[PDB]
Amino acid sequence: AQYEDGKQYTTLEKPVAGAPQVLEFFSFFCPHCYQFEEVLHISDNVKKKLPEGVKMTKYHVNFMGGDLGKDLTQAWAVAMALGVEDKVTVPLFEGVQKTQTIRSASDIRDVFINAGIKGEEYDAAWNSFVVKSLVAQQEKAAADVQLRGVPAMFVNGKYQLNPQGMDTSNMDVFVQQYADTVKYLSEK
Ligand SMILES: Cc1cc(C(=O)Nc2ccccc2F)no1
Ligand code: NA
Numbered sequence: 001a002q003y004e005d006g007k008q009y010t011t012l013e014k015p016v017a018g019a020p021q022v023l024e025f026f027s028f029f030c031p032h033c034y035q036f037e038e039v040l041h042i043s044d045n046v047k048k049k050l051p052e053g054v055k056m057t058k059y060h061v062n063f064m065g066g067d068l069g070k071d072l073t074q075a076w077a078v079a080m081a082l083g084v085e086d087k088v089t090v091p092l093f094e095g096v097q098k099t100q101t102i103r104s105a106s107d108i109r110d111v112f113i114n115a116g117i118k119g120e121e122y123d124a125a126w127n128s129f130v131v132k133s134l135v136a137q138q139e140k141a142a143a144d145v146q147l148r149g150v151p152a153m154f155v156n157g158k159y160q161l162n163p164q165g166m167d168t169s170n171m172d173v174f175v176q177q178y179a180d181t182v183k184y185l186s187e188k
Contacts, residue, residue, distance in 0.1 A: 003181065003184050003185075007162065007165060008161075008162055008165065008166070008181050009155075009159045009160060009161055009162055009181065009185055010159065010160045010162055011158065011159055011160075012145065012154070012157070012158055012159065012160060014146075015157050015158045016141075016144045016145060016154075016157030016158075017157065018157075019141070019144070019154065019156065019157025019158075020055045020056070020057035020157075021050075021054050021055045021056070021155065021156055021186060022046065022050065022054065022055065022056040022057065022153070022154075022155060022182065022186070023057045023058075023059070023141065023145075023153065023154040023155075023157070024042075024043060024056070024057070024058045024059070024151065024152070024153045024154075025058075025059050025060075025061050025141075025142060025145075025147055025150050025151065025152045025153075025154075026058065026059075026060060026061070026150050026151050027060060027061050027063075027064040027065065027069060027072070027150050028060070028065075028072050028092050028093055028095075028096045028097070028102075029064040029065040029069055029072075029096055029097070030064060030150045030151060031097065032150075032151055033093075033150055033151045034093045034097055036151050037089060037090075037093060038090055038093060039171070040171060040174070040175050041175070042151075042153075042175060042178060042179075043056065043058065045175050045176070045178070045179045046153075046178070046179045046182045048179070049179040049180065049182065049183045050182070050183060050186060054186070057141075058085070059076070059137075059138040059141055059142065060072055060073040060076035060138060061073065061138075061142055061147065061150055062139070062142075063148075064150070065096075068096075068102070068103070068104070068105075068108075071104075071105045071108055072092070072096075072108065073135060073138055073139075074126065074131065074135055075088075075092070075105075075108045075109075075112070075126075076138070077131040077132075077134035077135045077138065078112070078122065078125040078126055078131055079112075080134055081125050081128070081130055081131050081134060082117060082121070082125055084112070084115065084117055087115040087116065087117075088111055088112055088115050088117075091111045091114065091115060092108070092111055095107065095108075095111055109122055109123075109126075144157075145157075145160070153182065155182055155185035155186050156185070156186060156188075158185075158188075159185045159188070161178065161181060161182065161185075163178060166178070
């Protein structure tokens with residue numbers, strides 16, 4: 001077959017009911033995740049190949065970066081709660097991996113304030129139980145798919161993308177194969 005179970009994707013032994021149709025896990029400490037976001041724009045190209053309005057979800061993980069990694073999961077919950085993902089993703093990746101200026105929770109906050117989120121608004125969100133529930137949702141989703149590495153993408157809670165075997169000599173062709181594979185999986 002052109003798309004083979006065990007090759008370009010793997011079938012979860014324990015499917016996840018009610019899972020988002022497209023579910024991505026990442027860490028701001030994760031180098032391939034930085035590439036997937038700012039160099040390849042995987043999510044945006046996957047979105048362009050899927051039907052209008054399909055549910056795409058992106059969650060942060062705790063298992064990289066120790067204490068600051070877990071602060072970033074909570075900051076990503078703030079980003080989701082406020083709808084400012086597109087304003088903070090690049091500066092958070094740069095702060096962790098490029099400049100290494102993000103060393104504390106206060107440095108994470110600085111990124112949000114520089115991006116235009118008012119300090120009072122950030123602090124109210126950070127301390128809110130809406131954000132605690134989003135943190136719990138991110139942890140539970142990772143536990144559901146039994147997650148040990150990022151970046152990772154899961155489709156309809158049933159299939160995991162496997163990019164390892166794909167030709168990466170041309171970034172545009174790779175991104176196209178990735179997105180067409182997500183499309184194929186979503187149509188199964
Ligand atoms: C924010 C943010 C998201 C990512 C990321 O890795 N996206 C991604 C792309 C394709 C497949 C799985 C993925 F998790 N990095 O930063
Ligand atoms: Na194509």
